[PDB]
Amino acid sequence: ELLPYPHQLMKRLLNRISMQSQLIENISMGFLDNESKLPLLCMETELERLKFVIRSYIRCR
Amino acid sequence: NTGKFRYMPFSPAGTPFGFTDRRYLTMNEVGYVSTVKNSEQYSITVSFFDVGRFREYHFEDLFGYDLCFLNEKGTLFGQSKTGQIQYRPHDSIHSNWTKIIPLQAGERITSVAATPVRVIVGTSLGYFRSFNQFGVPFAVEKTSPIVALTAQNYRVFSVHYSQFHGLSYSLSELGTSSKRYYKRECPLPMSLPNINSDMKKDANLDYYNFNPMGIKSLFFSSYGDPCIFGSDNTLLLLSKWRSPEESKWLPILDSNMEIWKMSGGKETTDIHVWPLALAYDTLNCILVKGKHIWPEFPLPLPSEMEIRMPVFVKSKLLEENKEIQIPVSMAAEEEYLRSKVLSELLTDTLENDGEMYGNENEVLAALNGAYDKALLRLFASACSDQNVEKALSLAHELKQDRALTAAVKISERAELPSLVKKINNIREARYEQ
Amino acid sequence: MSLPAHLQQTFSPEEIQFIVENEPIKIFPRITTRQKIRNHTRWQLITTDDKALNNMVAMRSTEVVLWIALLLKQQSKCSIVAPQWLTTKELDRKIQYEKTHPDRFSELPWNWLVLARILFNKAKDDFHDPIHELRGKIQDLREIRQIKVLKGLKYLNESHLQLDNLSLLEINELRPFITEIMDKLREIHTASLTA
Amino acid sequence: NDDDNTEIIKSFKNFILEFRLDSQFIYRDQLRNNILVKNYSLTVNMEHLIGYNEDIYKKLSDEPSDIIPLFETAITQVAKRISILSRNSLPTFQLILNSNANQIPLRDLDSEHVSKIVRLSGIIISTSVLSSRATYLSIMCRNCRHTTSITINNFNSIVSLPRSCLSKNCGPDPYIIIHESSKFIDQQFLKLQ
């Protein structure tokens, strides 16, 4: 069956993704002017995993 | 006049050639150095652990170097006979150089140490030549024959052994502009392997041929505490090395006991320990499984071992004759001792060396909390024996007063009403302390 | 439809791998991110804690999420430490335990197969044991567990079932068959019990 | 001979259990799948065996008629190990080989190549009906009623009933076949052109 929607949890994750993407874009703009890009790649792949999880959840619903 | 008179070249955590053209020179905390014959000569490979600041490099050599020493800013190579030395900074901005050591009859280079201020060379005869980064000499000295060396950022450590004097340590800080000395030819308690060298060993004859005295490595700690390890399989630390009067040689680990108690009960021997460096209870060491003590080029992962004083008694640990069972009663006291000694060592560097990582104060507070937790456990154990005087003696060393309140609760709870009044008296005294 | 048919009620092996990728494991950092007392960007993630990553010290074992460790292992800037169950001795003991008890499964971690595959593929040189022997013993455990599953299948009742200590990948691969056979057996019984 | 047989059998068992190209034990998986569908056989590729160890291939090619039954016994032991929980009645498996050796012309087969391994081609022109060759043969002693069993390799050297009682004399031919307890396999005769 269709389980109840966790509205608060999805709202918090949406806010987190919005602010995280904004922070990533700000870091990229600052870097577009050391060269430790490993954390930036980590944020990118982490955000990708989170987005994939939420996409799969929503489509299953 | 043989065997130990052969002051054969030795490097921190060395290795013999064994049965191959290969050989490990030095295994420091910042990397390792290895040799190999190209069927006629050695090509020397230097690799680093901090991948991200240094880069591995292998270079051609025709001289056949026999000694090595590694640092954060440069590494030094040396030859046993006709001991030409070669110092190469890791960074390309500083030009590498080489020079010839003044060699004499019967002279053989034992060990070399490099410090960002000066470079010093050991000698079988016992010389203490001191140089600079670029090779220009500064001073030449002679003492008891040096056989091993270690260098921190600015302090160095040496062991002087001779067939007349024995094993005497000396720790001195060269410094940027202050050649401050902290010890000189003072004796040391390391046990030397002699009985095992009396033609009763399995494949250790080759290693003893490589290193006659079986000293494994003399690395420092993350905060500058000298450490010793050898065939006795026991670490040694200098607790209050700062004060010359406060010398304290403390055993911090026993490799055979730890190996046996982690092996499930078997007194296995094929497990040998190669320590690289100790850093606040983090003793990195290769645990090689087999008949060959020295490691290989598919280098085993430097598994970390924790410190354990040899308070473990085999008679007590044989409660379950054969996951080795641990009797908690003295195990808690062992943890108490660990916390006490680590608190002493951390405090030593707290006021002098200051903060290193930004968390030393917090870990110190947590360690003190664990110290009083172990004290409370021992207090409860003493109260279990209805020894009011034993509990009273244990209660004096409690540091946190929350542990003092817990001691009051234990006294009123562990069937000792008489202990309650004396613990309350101690707490009232502490109120004014 | 929004969800493809093959993803309707089961997880693809890629999904199981992704789920297992979030397990924490202990690794040896080959870099040292501990910013000294004397710039740089922190990981500051939201699916996990950045505290260990910002405070890594070279050749000092820490614990991080598995997929970050794999990402670092794409370079030589880290090193994976095999869990204690990935030793030859523990595998042999589990083999003996399985051969001793024919009716119950071993107490392996639920993600052992996928973890073994990932470590063999991407961390093939971080094992103290000969990898050619670890692969064989892993395959032997998989075969023995399969044999046990097949014998436990001959008792497919219509009420319930207890697959105790069974791993995750085996459950995922057996879900579409067992959960469909069980449905038909339940439906037959319910139709019979229509009075 | 028993020691050498055990050595070869153990070597072949190790070959089966260990051989793999890339993270997949091909022969183990093939044997398991064949057992799954009650197909007690195994197709062994020749280059795989050669690459595993040339000595095994040389010993096989020298006297195949004696090496192959040991390989079949090792296959049966592996099947018992990895298809049945220890603590039977499984038929001996049939070996199948695949090779890429030069195909010798049919008329080039001569006085040599006898008892060797030969690869060739042709066209089938006659397929006889299936006869039965015994593998497990329960046998009964005629007079003293001493029943035993015989295992037949079906690989003719270049076998008959024992010519003694083996525990009163019972005659030089004291044995009779126990048909209702013996085990047989199918055999077909083909004619190639």
Place this chain on the structure above:
Amino acid sequence: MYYGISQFSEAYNKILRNSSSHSSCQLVIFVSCLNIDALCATKMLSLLFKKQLVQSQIVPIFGYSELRRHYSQLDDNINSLLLVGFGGVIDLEAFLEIDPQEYVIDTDSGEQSFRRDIYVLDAHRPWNLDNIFGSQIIQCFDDGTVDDTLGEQKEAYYKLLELDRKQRKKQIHEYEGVLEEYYSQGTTVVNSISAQIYSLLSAIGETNLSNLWLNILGTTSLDIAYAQVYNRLYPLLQDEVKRLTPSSRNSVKTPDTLTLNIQPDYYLFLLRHSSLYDSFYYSNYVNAKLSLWNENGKKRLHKMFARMGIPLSTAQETWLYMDHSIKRELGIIFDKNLDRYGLQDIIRDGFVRTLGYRGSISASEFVEALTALLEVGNNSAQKLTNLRKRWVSNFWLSWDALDDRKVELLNRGIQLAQDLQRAIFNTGVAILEKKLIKHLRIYRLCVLQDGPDLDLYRNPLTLLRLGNWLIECCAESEDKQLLPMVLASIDENTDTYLVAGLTPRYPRGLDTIHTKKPILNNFSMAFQQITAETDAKVRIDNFESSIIEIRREDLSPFLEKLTLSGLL
């Protein structure tokens, strides 16, 4: 000199600073297809940049026109370009229409920086002085020749640069003459790109067994044509193999053991993947040593195989399936009966790679398979472009053949190598029967007008392989003096011939004073001068200058003019 061996790491770090921005892909790698060494070097660089996660573009180029068209299409964001296997002999800034002023950024301060930095890597010795000296955008990775043997050339070039009376004109003429005699020299190669990048990698310290194997393959790629360079570089690869191999020798073979070994690697053709008899029959050295194109050659081949006492059926059996007796006494058998027929040079020591139970493989067989995959992996200016497309596509097949997970592709490459050797052998025997080679006092012309599988030779590498066959065959003919041969093949679809200027070489194993002196292919300037005048719709676009496409009608006049030309 621009970039010496000792300062390659500086160029690496500069490139890393320039284009280690994962937001974009500002580094592009240009590689000349139909060149094994360039493919190996590009694989090294691709693996290295996969390590540092630097986004890169790999573009296989066949002709110069493609290079200029791509550069015109090239976007301005890309601040770093890599040329592999070409560009070190031609005026790139003139070829690509490049001036320093458009690309220069932050000019100030005795320094200069540029918005796009191009780094070339080829070992062709005619180093373009305007590219090695008079530019900052063009960056060349010298192998020690320019800094040591072009000092006078450097002085003359700088004198001309600084000077843009009678004695002044005299000295200008002398300097120009020195520069010109430096030029007008046949294109020759002294080093292998794989060795250079392996040295750079060792300076960076990111070497491994795979990179060493790639360097072995790249160096072996130059053995057939530049055997002197191969002998020069062999000890370095040998020492690297000794260094990198683990001390745990004679270990039990596991499906995971990857072992590089130095063992007798006889100079045969696909020995481990073909019969011994076929290996001898298809070996270029043996064929040249006995001239197998005549009917006597096969009889003498049987004569050797009888003389060693090896049965012909055994010799004709596949290598894997031979009896272990011969497979373990091949070395002694060669020792006994090789000097008798003069084939002692066949015995050689090479590098063999073994990957678990997959069987061994030699470098020569691997490079032959790679070349075969390059050649046959799959109105007038349209179908030719499709041929370029297919030739470039085969580069990726050869590239993916390097993966150990694609051994099926390697098997197809081995089969293609066998078939190509068969076709080249049959073409050579037919040509030497009909005597299509017409000897002159300048060059031995040979044009294929009609016959079998003539569509195979429009691929440049196929024509070069046929040239290797015929030049090896003619090299062992002491009566036939040293002289280049010219090969042409009419493409009926395009009605054009493919003229391939070749060069003679000394017989393999024949080491003399003149052998140390390399043969210089002077077809480049001759072709270009003949083409510049008397417009004949000639298409000279190959990085190998001694290859042109000529109209069928203009083929004969072009050859007549070339005979009238004494430049080569």
Place this chain on the structure above:
Amino acid sequence: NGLDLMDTNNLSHQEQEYLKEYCDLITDLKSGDLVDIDLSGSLVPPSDVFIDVRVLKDAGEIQTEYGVFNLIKDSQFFVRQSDVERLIQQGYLQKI
């Protein structure tokens, strides 16, 4: 939805209008509130971030998010899997 919008003769007029409006509805759902995530994105987990690809169909030059991609046929990129998903879905890049 991210691949192509297509022989419609196999569908009745009601079905064609249904598909036309359903694409609009899907786009409305993607742009309504869950716009930060791509609802039409791949359902396979993003196991790896950087991959290599080969150009199948030459598309000249296409501006990516930050730089630009020169989709020369028979040329291989090694770039992030994130910004090339749509191109691979359309059928321009092949390698994984």
